[PDB]
Design a protein around this ligand. Structure first.
Ligand SMILES: Fc1ccc(-c2n[nH]cc2-c2ccncc2)cc1
Ligand SMILES: Fc1ccc(-c2n[nH]cc2-c2ccncc2)cc1
Length: 327
């Protein structure tokens, strides 16, 4: 077992192997930029807040570790290392996650059309992989998109309101992966105009703003809504038509406009998928079918289990010990 050293940073206690030096806060568990003396690389170390404060925390802790250990793709945060100072399950109460250090995030940056292309391309490439594993991000937003100096991008926190799919603004329990495509659409639009596409003040205001652009629900989509209250609410609002994106985003690359219309489609069943988007002409310059990999199967069966805190903890502990660094 490696040698750990203790230190305090912003009222938070950090106990990490000596291979990690020069820890310095970068954001919020908590994250510290650091230097890995074994690899010689700059990394980001995240310390989970209270990994086992409750069954929910315990399971959440397990879920994140499982997800990170599975993600092995250039455009997705991956695990360089995971560790705990604990020498045994008995005293196991802290979890640290390590990944390559990424300079900033999209929320920080803001772009020209060429930059948007490369950035959105990467998001979609990462999303294809994630979605092929039957995983849905559910909370894609600028702050969850890490980018380094090279404009290389990685998706973070698979886990505000502005990038949430409309079906989610409503309470639809059966939304699918396409909710992530909607978020991309909002993000892309933001990168092109420099303004939040739908800055809703609340669930009602948010949905209101969305329908103003994409128009109110047609008959085919209306047929798919089981909730009576959802229908009363929706069908009572002032009917509005889908707007001409060419006019709304006028001046922008016509190809970008085409893609946006395909992403920001109200009916989730009609939204372009990540795989299809990568083939869209907007990404002609970057698209390569032989270099847009899918992920191995991801076992999500644990999600339906109701276990004790100690069982989730022990499950997590086992995942820490079984971890094998990347090549
Ligand atoms: F293992 C991990 C997993 C996630 C993080 C992280 N969470 N929020 C932001 C980051 C982050 C910050 C800087 N560079 C890469 C990732 C850090 C280490
Ligand atoms: F006003 C709206 C906003 C979004 C939707 C929607 N898009 N994809 C799926 C749905 C949806 C919402 C609620 N119940 C079933 C399906 C339907 C009506």
């Amino acid at each position: 077992r490696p040698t750990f050293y203790r230190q305090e940073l912003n009222k938070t206690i950090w106990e990490v192997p000596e291979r990690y030096q020069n820890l310095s806060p970068v954001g919020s568990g908590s994250v510290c930029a650091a230097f890995d003396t074994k690899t010689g690389l700059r990394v980001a170390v995240k310390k989970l807040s209270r990994p086992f404060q409750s069954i929910i925390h315990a399971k959440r802790t397990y879920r994140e570790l499982r997800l990170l250990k599975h993600m092995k793709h250039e455009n997705v945060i991956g695990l360089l290392d995971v560790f705990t100072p604990a020498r045994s399950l008995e005293e196991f109460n802290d979890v640290y996650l390590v990944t390559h250090l990424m300079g900033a995030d999209l929320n920080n940056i803001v772009l020209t059309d060429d930059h948007v292309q490369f950035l959105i391309y990467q998001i979609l490439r990462g999303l294809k992989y994630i979605h092929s594993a039957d995983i849905i991000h559910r909370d894609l937003k600028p702050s969850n998109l890490a980018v380094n100096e090279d404009c290389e991008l990685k998706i973070l926190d698979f886990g505000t309101r502005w990038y949430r799919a409309p079906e989610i603004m409503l309470n639809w329990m059966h939304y699918n992966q396409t909710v992530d495509i909607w978020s991309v659409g909002c993000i892309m639009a933001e990168l092109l105009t420099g303004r939040t596409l739908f800055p809703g003040t609340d669930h009602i205001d948010q949905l209101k703003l969305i329908l103003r652009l994409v128009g109110t629900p047609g008959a085919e989509l209306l047929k798919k809504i089981s909730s009576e209250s959802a229908r009363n609410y929706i069908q009572s609002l002032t009917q509005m038509p889908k707007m001409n994106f060419a006019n709304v985003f006028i001046g922008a690359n016509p190809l970008a406009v085409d893609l946006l219309e395909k992403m920001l489609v109200l009916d989730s069943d009609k939204r372009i998928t990540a795989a299809q988007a990568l083939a869209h002409a907007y990404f002609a310059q970057y698209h390569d079918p032989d270099d847009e990999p899918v992920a191995d199967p991801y076992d999500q069966s644990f999600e339906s289990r109701d276990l004790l805190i100690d069982e989730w903890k022990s499950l997590t502990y086992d995942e820490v010990i079984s971890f094998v660094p990347p090549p």
